[PDB]
Amino acid sequence: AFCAPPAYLTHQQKVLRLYKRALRHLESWCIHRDKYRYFACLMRARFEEHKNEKDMMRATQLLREAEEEFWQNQHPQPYIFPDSPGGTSFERYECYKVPEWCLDYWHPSEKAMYPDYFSKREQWKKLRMESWDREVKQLQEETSPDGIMTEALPPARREGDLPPLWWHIVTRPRERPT
Amino acid sequence: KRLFVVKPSLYYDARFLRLMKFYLMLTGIPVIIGITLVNIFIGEAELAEIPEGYIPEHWEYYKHPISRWIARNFY
Amino acid sequence: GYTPDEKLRLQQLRELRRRWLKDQELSPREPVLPLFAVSHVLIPMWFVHYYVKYHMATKPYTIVSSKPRIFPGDTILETGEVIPPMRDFPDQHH
Amino acid sequence: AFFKAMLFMCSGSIIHSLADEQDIRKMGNITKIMPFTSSCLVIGSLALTGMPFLTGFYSKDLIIEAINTCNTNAWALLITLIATSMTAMYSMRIIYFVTMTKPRFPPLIS
Amino acid sequence: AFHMTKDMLPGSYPRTPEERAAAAKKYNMRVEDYEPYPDDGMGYGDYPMLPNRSQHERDPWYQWDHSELRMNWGEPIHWDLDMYIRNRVDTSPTPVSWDVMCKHLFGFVAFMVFMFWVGHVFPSYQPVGPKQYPYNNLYLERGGDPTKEPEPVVHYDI
Amino acid sequence: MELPDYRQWKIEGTPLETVQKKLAARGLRDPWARNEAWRYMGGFAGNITFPSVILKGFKWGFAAFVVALGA
Amino acid sequence: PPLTLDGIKDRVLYVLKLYDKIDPEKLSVNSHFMKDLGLDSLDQVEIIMAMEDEFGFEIPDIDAEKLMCPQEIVDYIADKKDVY
Amino acid sequence: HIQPRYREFPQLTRSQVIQGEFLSSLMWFWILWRFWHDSDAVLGHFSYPDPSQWTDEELGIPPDD
Amino acid sequence: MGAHLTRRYLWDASVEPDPEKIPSFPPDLGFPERKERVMVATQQEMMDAQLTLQQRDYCAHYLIRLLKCKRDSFPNFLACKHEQHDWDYCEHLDYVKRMKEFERERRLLQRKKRRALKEA
Amino acid sequence: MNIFTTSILLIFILLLSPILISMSNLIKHINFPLYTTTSIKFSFIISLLPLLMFFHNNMEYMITTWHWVTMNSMELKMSFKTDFFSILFTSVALFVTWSIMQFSSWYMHSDPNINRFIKYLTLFLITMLILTSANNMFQLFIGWEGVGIMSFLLIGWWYGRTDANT
Amino acid sequence: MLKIILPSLMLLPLTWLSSPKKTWTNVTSYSFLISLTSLTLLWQTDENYKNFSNMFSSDPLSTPLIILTAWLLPLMLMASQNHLKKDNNVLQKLYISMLISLQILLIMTFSATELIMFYILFEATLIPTLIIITRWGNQTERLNAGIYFLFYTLIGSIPLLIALILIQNHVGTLNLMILSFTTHTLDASWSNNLLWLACMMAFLIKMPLYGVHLWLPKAHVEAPIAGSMILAAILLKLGSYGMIRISIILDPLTKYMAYPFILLSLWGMIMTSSICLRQTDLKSLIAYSSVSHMALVIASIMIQTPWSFMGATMLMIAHGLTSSLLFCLANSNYERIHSRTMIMARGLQMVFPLMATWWLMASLANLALPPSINLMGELFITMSLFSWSNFTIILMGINIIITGMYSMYMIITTQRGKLTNHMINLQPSHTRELTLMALHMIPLILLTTSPKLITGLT
C-alpha cells in the first residue's frame, strides 16, 4: 500500500509474484504442514528449472502456461489472512478510524480535559504550516524535466525540511483504533 | 500507555438531548403528576340512567373528569 | 529494491509517525473529568399486577384460558361433581 | 438452539483466543491448548450428530424415524438420511481440523 | 457552478477527430483511449466508454484517493459506477468459467427437481393400512352437523 | 518476552523428517523445514487420535456411573 | 501483548536464523538478503512469506518487492501495525 | 492473566483442565446412566411382527374357492 | 422403506396393495364374523380431557391415564412411566392391527390373481 | 392465575428496562453490560414460572393488553398468546440470550461502543419474543419486520467494512 | 376556523414590524402556539362534522392536515434560518412572510366548503411556492423548474375551472355539503367521461401521476429546503384532498374511468421506485420516493373502498412528515458538503453520530417497518388493491422490495462506509438541525400510538 505502482510489470515481478500466489494456493490444498512443506519444495523445483532460459520468447511461454496451469489448479477458498483483502478483519476496525481533522471542532470544554494532548497537537500543526512552502517548492524545483512522472515523491534532501506531502502518511488514523 | 482516541465532537450530539430530554421532562412530569393524581383521587365516573327529565348537560356524557372539564369550560 | 531516495522518504516519514504516535500518548491526568435485584423486579412487578388485576381482569375477554383438562375420576371443585370413572379394560399383556 | 449456540460461542472462544483467525486451515490442536472449549465443542458436536442420550437424540431421531415411517417422496427420504450422515461428516471436519491435528496457528501463542 | 466552464463539462458526440482529441483532454484521458460511447443517440454523448470492470478488482492494496470507490481523483468515472460499486454488481474473474457455472447450477436444480418427481411417482410407504378413528371418523367432533348423522363408517378387528 | 533458542528446533523426531528424507531422495533440501518444527517439536508433539477426543473424560464418567448405580 | 520494536526486531531475525540457506551466525540486520546473504530473488519471496506468517498479516506485493535488508522488514512490519 | 508464549505449549491453569474434564465426564455419566436405566435406543421395546407369518385364518384369507 | 416397495414399484404389481384404499374388500372377504373395534373412552371423556383430535385413537383411553398421572405427580416428570408404556403398547397393538389389515389386503388381492388363472 | 398473566407481561417490561436506561443519562453511571446480563437472568426465572404452570395443567392464555384502533369491523389490539409454543420458546430464548450477553461482554471487550451493542441485542430479543407471542398477525408482522431491521443493524455492526454492509 | 387563520395572518404583521434580530423568534415561537390552537379542531366527539361557518368547514379529512400545515410553518422557518441568514433583512422578512402565506392559504384550502374556493386558494398556493423556488433557488435551472411547476399545474387548472362552473350550472351550488346530499349521478356519456377527466386531472397533476410527475423531481431539486418541505408535505397532498372531495360527484364514471390511472400509477409506482435505486442526487431520490409513495395514494383514491381512503389518509399525513424529515436531513448534508451528490459524504455516522439515528428512523419510516402509521397505511391500500384484483399484489409487491432497497441504500452510502477523506471539514451539528428533525419524528412516534385521528372520512 505504501510504495507506488510501477507502470508496466517486468517479466520478473510477474514470475516472482506467481511464486507467491502459487505457493500460497498450495497451502489451501495441503492443509497439513509436512505434506505442504513437501509439496512446495517440489514447486520451487518447477520454478527453479527454467530459471536460466535466456530465450525470452520461451520464458514468456512458460509463464503464460504457468498462470493457466495455476488458474485451473487453484483452490476456490484459499487461505487469505485477516487484515488482507477479501478476508475478514479487513475493514473491521475502520469504523473507529476517524480522520483526525475532527478534533478541531471540539468544544472548548472537551478539549479542556486532555490538556497536554492538544499542547503537542498544536506543535505538530505548526510543523505542517511551517514547511508547506519549502515542501511544494521542493516538489516543484525537483519536478520532472519530462512528461514522465511517477507517483513517487522525493525525500527531504535538506535539514529541517520535512520529507514532503507527509501530513497524511504521518498523522494517519491508527490501524486498530481500539 | 493509554492512548488518545479521536472521536467526533460529541457535545453537539449530547447538548441536544440534555435540552430535549429536559424541556420534555420539564412540562412532562407536572402533567404525569396531573394525570396520576386526578385519575387517583378524582377518578373516572360510573355510568348511570338519565333520571326521568334530567336532560344532562354536554359535560355530563363524558367519563374522565379533566376530559369533561375541557368540554364544560370550552366546548 | 529500495531506490536510494525512496528509503530516505520512508526513513524520514516513519521517524515522524513515531513522534505522532508518542504525542498521541496520554499524559498522566490527561483525562481531567471536571438487594437492588428486588428493586427492578419487585417495583416493576407491583405495577404490572396493579395493571393486570384491576384493568385486564376487570375488562371483558382480556385474559381467557382453556379448560383444566379434567380426567375420569377427578372432582370438579366449583360444582362439586365427581367425574365418572372409565370402564375396566383388562387388556394388559404389556 | 442449545447446541448451535454452543458451537458458535465455542468458535467465538477459538477465534478471539487466536489472533482473530476465522479459518480452520490455520487453527489446530485446540484440544490440548484449550481443553475447556474443545470439551464444549465435542459435547456440542455430538449433540449436533444426535449422539444417543443427549438433547439432539431426544428430538432428532423422532424426526428421522418419522420420515422412515411416513409416506413420502423417495427422493426426499433418501436425501434427508444422507444429509444426516453429512451432518456427522462436517461435524467430523470441524473437530479434526479445529481440534485433533498438529497446531498450525501463528507461532506466538496467547 | 463553482469553476466549471461548459467546455470543462461534457458535450456532443465528437464528430471530427480534433474534437475526439479535445474531449480526451477534458476527461483527463489519453487521446487514443477515449472511445466515445457508440453514437446511437441514447444520450451518452462524449462520455468515455471505460472498461466495464467493477471496482471490486481494482488493486485492493493501492492508496486510492477515494478509498471506497477505489477511484483516484480525476480519473474518468464509469457511466454505471452506481452499479459497479463494491457494494453491488461484481465482475471479478471466477476460478470456474461462467458458462460452466450456469450449466452446472441449473443442471443440479433440474436433476433435483426431476428426481423429486421420480419420487412422487414412486413414494415410500410402510406396510401399514390406514389409521382408524372412532365414532364416524369423528364426524361430529371434526365439527360435523349434530343433527344429520353420517353414514356409519365402521372399523372391524384384525 | 524471551524467545526459545533458535537452535532448540531440529527436524528429526518429527513428521518433517520423513518429508525431509523423501525430498532428499529427489535431491531437494527442504530449507524452511526447521521453522515449521515447533509445530511438531514439543507439547504439541503427541499425535491426537479421534477416539481420544470423543472419549475424553469417559474414564471418570463411567467411574461416576458405577458409583451412582451402586447407590 | 502489543509488539514492541525490539521484539519484532528479534522475531524477524530469529526466523531467518532458521532458514537453512541464511547463515545463522551472520544474518545481521542491515545484511541485505540478496547482495550480502546472497539469496535468490526467488528466496526473498519466501523469506517475506515466512514473516507474513510469523506476524500474521500480508505484506503487499509492491511493498514487498523491497523487503530486502533484514531490517526494512522490521520497521515496515512495525510501521504497519502502528508500533511507536 | 496469562503470559504470551513463543513456540511452546501454552501453560494451562488448574481450572481450565478440571472444568473441561468435568463437562465431558458428566456427558459420559449421563449417556451411560440413561443407557442402563433406559435402553430403548435399540429395539424400542416393542418387536416388529413378521408380516409374513400370519396364518391365512388370521387375516381372513378365504380358502381359495 | 421395506421390501414392500420393491415388490410393487420394481418387479411385480397389482399384487402389492395400494397404500390408499387399503380397506378395499368387503369387511368380510371370508371373515366369518368380526366384532367391530371397541372404544373404551366416552366421546365426552375425550372432549373433557381436551385430547387433540389426532390423539383420539383407540388408545385414547390409556392416554387420558397418562395425562392424569402427569398433571398429578406434577413436580415429578419422571414417574408416569408405566402409563407411557401402556399407551405406547396400545399404540403398537393397533400399529400391528394396521400391519395385519395391510397384509390381509395384500394376500386377498393375490387370491384374486390366483383365482384369475383358474379362469381359463 | 394472575401470576401467569402478570409473568408474561412482566418479561417484556423487564427487558425493555435496559432500553430506556440508555435513553436517559443513567447508563453512564452504572455498568450497562452487567446490568443487562442480570435482567435477562431475572427474565429467564420469570419465564420459568408460567412454564411450570403450563406443565401442571395445559392452559392457553390470550392476553389483550391494549387496544390500538377500532378500524370499524376489523378491531386491532395488542395480544400475546401463551400457548405451548410461546412460553416454551420464551424460556429457551432467554437462556440462550443470558448465555450470549455474558459472552458478548468478553467478546466485544475493547469495542469502544459495547453499550450500544448490548442495547441492540436486547431490542432484538424484544422483537423476537413479540414475534413468538403474537396473537393478531399485525403484531407477528411487527416482530417479523422488526428482527429483520435490527439484524441489518447488527450484521453490519462494523459499518466501515463494506463486506458487512453488503 | 378563524383562529387557525386570523392569528396566522397577524404573523405577517409581526414578521415585518418586528426587530431584524428578533424577527425569527417572534415568528417561530408564535406559530408553534398557532399549531396548539389548531389542535382544538381535533375535538370531534360526534360524527356530525364541524361546519364552523358558511365558507369554513373541517371534517375528518381536512383536520388531520390543517394541523400538519400549521405544524410545518414553525419547522419550515427553522430549517431556513441558515441559508436565508445571509440575506439583507428584507429578503428574510419576505421569505418568512411567503412561508406564512402558504399555510394561511393551505389552511383555508384544506378548510374550504366551496370547491371553487378550493380552486382559487388551490392555484394561489403556486404564487408563494414559485417565488420560494425561483427567487431563492441555488441552481441555474430553477427558472426552468419554476416554469414546469407553473405550467403543469396551470394547464390542469383551467379544465377544473370550466368543470366546476359547469357543475354549478348543472346542480346549482359548489357547496361540498350539499353536493354530497344531492343527486349528482353522471350518465356515462362520452362527454361525462370527459368531465370526470377534467375534474380529476388537475388534482392528478400536483399529485404526481406516472405520466405527469417530471415537474416534482425538477422542482424539489433546485427548490430551497423550505420549498421542498412544503411541496412534499402539504403541496402534493392538496391534489389528494381535492380528489377525495370532488369524486363525491362523478360517482358512477370512476368505476370504469379509473383503470387508465390505476394502471398508470401501479406500474408507475414500480418504475419511480426503481430509478430511485440508481440516482446520484439524494434530493432526486427522495423526490422519486415521493412520486412512488404518492402513486399508491392515487390508486386508493380511485379504487374507492373505505379502507383505501383510510389507508390514503394515513399514508398522506405519515409520508408528508417522513418526506420532509428526509428532505430536511438531505439539506443538512448539502450545506456542509455543498454538493447534492450521494456518492460523496460517506461515513457520516462516524462524524455525526445522532443525525445518523434520525437518518435511520426516517428510512425505517420510508420503508414500511410495522409499528409505524406508514406501514398501516400501505397495508391497507395493499389490501383493497388486492380486493380490486388479486394480481395487484405482484406490482404492489415489486414496489415493497424496491422501496426497501433504495431506503437502506440512502442510509448505506450516505451514513455508513469509510469517512470521506477530507471534504471541507464537516462542522458539528447545530441544535436547530437536530430539533428540526426531532420536531418531525416525535409527532410521527406520537401519531403512531393512536392512529384513529388521521384515519380518514371512510
Ligand SMILES: CCCCCCCCCCCCCCCCCC(=O)OC[C@H](COP(=O)(O)OCCN)OC(=O)CCCCCCCCCCCCCCCCC
Ligand atoms: C393530528 C394530525 C397530524 C398532525 C401531525 C403534526 C402534529 C404536531 C403537533 C401536535 C402533536 C401532538 C398531537 C399528535 C399526537 C397525538 C398523540 C396521541 O393522540 O396519543 C393518544 C394516546 C392514547 O391512546 P388512544 O389511542 O386514545 O387509546 C386507544 C384505545 N383503543 O395517548 C398516549 O398514549 C400518549 C403516549 C405518549 C408516548 C407514546 C410513545 C409510544 C410509541 C409507540 C411506537 C413506538 C415505535 C414507533 C416506530 C415508528 C417508526 C417510524
